[PDB]
Amino acid sequence: TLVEQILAEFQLQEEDLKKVMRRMQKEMDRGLRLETHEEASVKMLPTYVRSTPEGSEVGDFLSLDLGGTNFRVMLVKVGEGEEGQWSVKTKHQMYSIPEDAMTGTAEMLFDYISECISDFLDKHQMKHKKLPLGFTFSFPVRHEDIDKGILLNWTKGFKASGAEGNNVVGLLRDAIKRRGDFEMDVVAMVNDTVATMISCYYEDHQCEVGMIVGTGCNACYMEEMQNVELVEGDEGRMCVNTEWGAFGDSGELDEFLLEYDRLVDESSANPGQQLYEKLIGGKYMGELVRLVLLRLVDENLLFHGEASEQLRTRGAFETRFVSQVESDTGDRKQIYNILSTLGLRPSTTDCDIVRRACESVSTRAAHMCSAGLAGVINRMRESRSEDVMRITVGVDGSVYKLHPSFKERFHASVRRLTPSCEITFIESEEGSGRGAALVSAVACKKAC
Ligand SMILES: Cc1cnc(Nc2nc(C)cs2)c(OCc2ccccc2)c1
Numbered sequence: 001t002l003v004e005q006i007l008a009e010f011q012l013q014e015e016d017l018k019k020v021m022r023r024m025q026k027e028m029d030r031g032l033r034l035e036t037h038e039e040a041s042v043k044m045l046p047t048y049v050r051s052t053p054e055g056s057e058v059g060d061f062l063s064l065d066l067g068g069t070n071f072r073v074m075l076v077k078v079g080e081g082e083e084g085q086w087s088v089k090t091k092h093q094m095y096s097i098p099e100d101a102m103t104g105t106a107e108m109l110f111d112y113i114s115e116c117i118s119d120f121l122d123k124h125q126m127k128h129k130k131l132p133l134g135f136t137f138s139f140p141v142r143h144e145d146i147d148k149g150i151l152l153n154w155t156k157g158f159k160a161s162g163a164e165g166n167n168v169v170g171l172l173r174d175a176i177k178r179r180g181d182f183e184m185d186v187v188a189m190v191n192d193t194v195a196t197m198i199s200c201y202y203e204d205h206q207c208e209v210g211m212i213v214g215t216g217c218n219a220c221y222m223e224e225m226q227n228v229e230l231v232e233g234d235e236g237r238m239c240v241n242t243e244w245g246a247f248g249d250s251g252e253l254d255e256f257l258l259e260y261d262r263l264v265d266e267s268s269a270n271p272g273q274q275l276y277e278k279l280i281g282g283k284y285m286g287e288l289v290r291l292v293l294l295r296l297v298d299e300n301l302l303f304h305g306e307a308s309e310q311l312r313t314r315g316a317f318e319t320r321f322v323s324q325v326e327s328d329t330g331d332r333k334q335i336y337n338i339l340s341t342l343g344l345r346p347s348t349t350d351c352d353i354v355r356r357a358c359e360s361v362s363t364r365a366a367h368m369c370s371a372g373l374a375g376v377i378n379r380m381r382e383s384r385s386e387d388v389m390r391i392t393v394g395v396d397g398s399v400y401k402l403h404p405s406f407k408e409r410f411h412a413s414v415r416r417l418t419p420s421c422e423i424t425f426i427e428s429e430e431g432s433g434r435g436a437a438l439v440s441a442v443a444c445k446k447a448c
């Protein structure tokens with residue numbers, strides 16, 4: 001109990017999640033009206049991907065994904081069958097992100113990207129061609145059009161200087177001309193939430209949400225255009241990147257924020273920002289555990305009171321440990337080897353506590369997230385017909401796909417909050433690559 005008292009702190013009651021779900025619905029409406037959109041913590045951003053597409057182009061497209069831990073490049077082909085486009089990644093390649101790119105200027109970052117883009121085109125001899133290029137850019141962007149928009153600010157721990165405030169698609173081109181090595185027609189810039197929804201629509205036409213629970217946490221949904229005041233028009237629907245990770249930045253979570261959350265936030269690349277994301281994201285979960293463990297040893301409840309050298313350095317506890325720990329079959333060998341690598345010698349009950357700590361952190365994350373989705377799905381259900389409103393949600397992100405139980409805890413809780421709704425989850429088999437391509441395919445029936 002002395003331990004379970006400290007852990008029970010991470011608990012959230014059914015009534016707590018409802019309160020969170022209602023507060024999200026609120027910030028959502030606030031960021032959609034013109035009069036509040038500006039200081040709304042949930043920015044609710046028009047993506048310019050719209051309800052009824054005009055028509056699509058076929059052929060190969062070049063897709064970029066940045067915003068992950070890693071930058072990726074892939075070529076995807078696009079065709080047409082009975083029900084809309086089919087897409088399929090045909091070639092691909094990842095490129096680690098250097099420290100000299102993340103510290104330097106936006107200009108340096110993008111040249112590095114320009115390079116990897118040429119390196120890629122080498123290995124597959126294609127440097128001589130000019131294809132439509134879809135860009136999945138996993139950051140808050142204020143779009144002027146499907147291929148126009150500026151970076152509002154970095155999240156997840158990117159710093160590249162003098163990037164905020166500028167057009168991203170521009171900079172991409174800027175860097176390609178700083179090469180002459182090749183040409184590319186940049187036709188669409190989309191959020192990963194959005195890339196993922198689109199990749200999934202073609203599978204299930206009812207797929208109208210894209211949720212990412214990976215290093216960050218964000219969601220996007222199809223909204224009524226008359227509700228999108230920042231964009232002119234009333235017919236049809238535009239996809240809206242909620243950027244809900246910023247939920248709580250106006251202080252809507254304060255009654256739920258634990259000391260471990262205050263500490264993570266303080267030391268983060270962005271104090272006071274992405275507060276909701278820091279309860280859930282992968283950038284942050286392993287760190288929450290680490291802080292919890294360190295609290296537990298400072299109360300002589302763990303590791304005999306003595307914390308490791310690494311256990312004491314920030315970020316030393318990787319989110320992917322939290323998974324491994326929660327995967328241990330019950331024999332404790334999975335948990336032991338982990339703490340072993342971190343310079344500790346866990347007793348048996350040491351291991352059993354660390355399991356409990358993870359479960360406490362990740363399960364909070366699961367539920368906190370479900371409130372958010374639930375509040376989206378409720379909002380959609382509100383401006384829309386009804387009986388049992390079926391709806392599909394396209395999902396992606398390591399935390400969701402790999403953490404052994406987050407998925408189960410998350411589905412259960414979402415459903416508890418959404419009666420009358422029959423929610424279906426699909427995991428995007430390469431949703432970035434093909435979501436972008438699919439969106440470029442239709443953007444490019446205008447720019448080609
Ligand atoms: C594959 C796909 C790709 N693009 C779509 N729409 C797009 N609109 C613009 C301005 C660019 S691409 C699109 O619209 C259909 C749709 C998607 C999600 C919800 C409702 C309709 C589907």
Ligand SMILES: OC[C@H]1O[C@H](O)[C@H](O)[C@@H](O)[C@@H]1O
Pocket residue numbers: 067137138139140155156191192193212214215216217218219243245277
């Ligand atoms: O990586 C998933 C999410 O991470 C962060 O919240 C980004 O701001 C958002 O654009 C993205 O969708």
